């Protein structure tokens, strides 16, 4: 029956948590049950950073990076290959 001891969430001593929106589907998912991923990406990819630095109007400009936190529902997480169906013993692993 019980596939998980925490029932898949991360909520222990509360009764309710606010919903959030899956980043790919817009499905209402609880905050603690959401699959949370943090992405830091350069605005300019490695294939173009040469051209940008080449004809640049500044002297020592340091290119910035984005910072967005993504939350997925379970169905979108698995399908998007963010997370996989692990082994029965590997489920307990939490690293």
């Amino acid at each position: 029956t019980s596939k998980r001891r925490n029932n898949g969430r991360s909520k222990k001593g509360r009764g309710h948590t606010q919903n959030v929106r899956c980043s790919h589907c817009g499905r209402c998912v609880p905050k603690d049950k959401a699959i949370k991923r943090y992405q830091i990406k350069n605005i300019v990819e490695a294939a173009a950073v040469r051209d940008i630095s080449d004809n640049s109007a500044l002297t020592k400009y340091k290119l910035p990076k984005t910072y967005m936190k993504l939350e997925y529902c379970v169905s979108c997480g698995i399908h998007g290959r963010v997370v996989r169906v692990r082994s029965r013993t590997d489920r307990r692993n939490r690293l």
């Binding site: 943090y38 002297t59 020592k60 400009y61 340091k62 910035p64 990076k65 984005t66 910072y67």
Partner: protein
């Protein structure tokens, strides 16, 4: 011809602004410039200034960058921001402040010496209106 009616003006003078030639020059324009360009120094690059023919604002890059996952964010109002910092000998991962402690903390920001209340490192003024 679409541009034959255009005239150019001037405002470190940081740049030029186009305007339609007068007919039967209007210029409360708002210009957003970087503090690095104004002071010709890259140490001021994380700021944006507004001028009206006004206000300032932290750049969007910097504001996202200085938000850390396991600390406490403190804001007030002139908008100020802050974050409780770690310590050299600190071992536990999360350094949160109490609610009672937080209310005490509510060109250079040295605001920090609140160092007698908690450990703070990332103190900025993110906006002026």
């Amino acid at each position: 011809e679409p541009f034959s009616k255009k005239e150019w003006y001037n405002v470190r003078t940081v740049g030029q602004i186009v305007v339609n030639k007068t007919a039967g020059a209007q210029l409360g324009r708002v210009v957003e410039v970087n503090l690095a360009d104004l002071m010709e120094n890259e140490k001021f690059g994380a700021y944006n200034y507004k001028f009206k023919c006004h206000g300032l604002k932290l750049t969007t890059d910097k504001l996202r960058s200085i938000v850390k996952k396991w600390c406490t964010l403190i804001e007030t109002s002139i908008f100020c921001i802050g974050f409780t910092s770690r310590k050299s000998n600190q071992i536990k991962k999360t350094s949160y402040a109490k609610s009672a402690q937080i209310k005490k903390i509510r060109r250079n920001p040295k605001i920090v010496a609140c160092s007698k209340v908690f450990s703070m490192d990332n103190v900025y003024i993110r906006k002026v209106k």
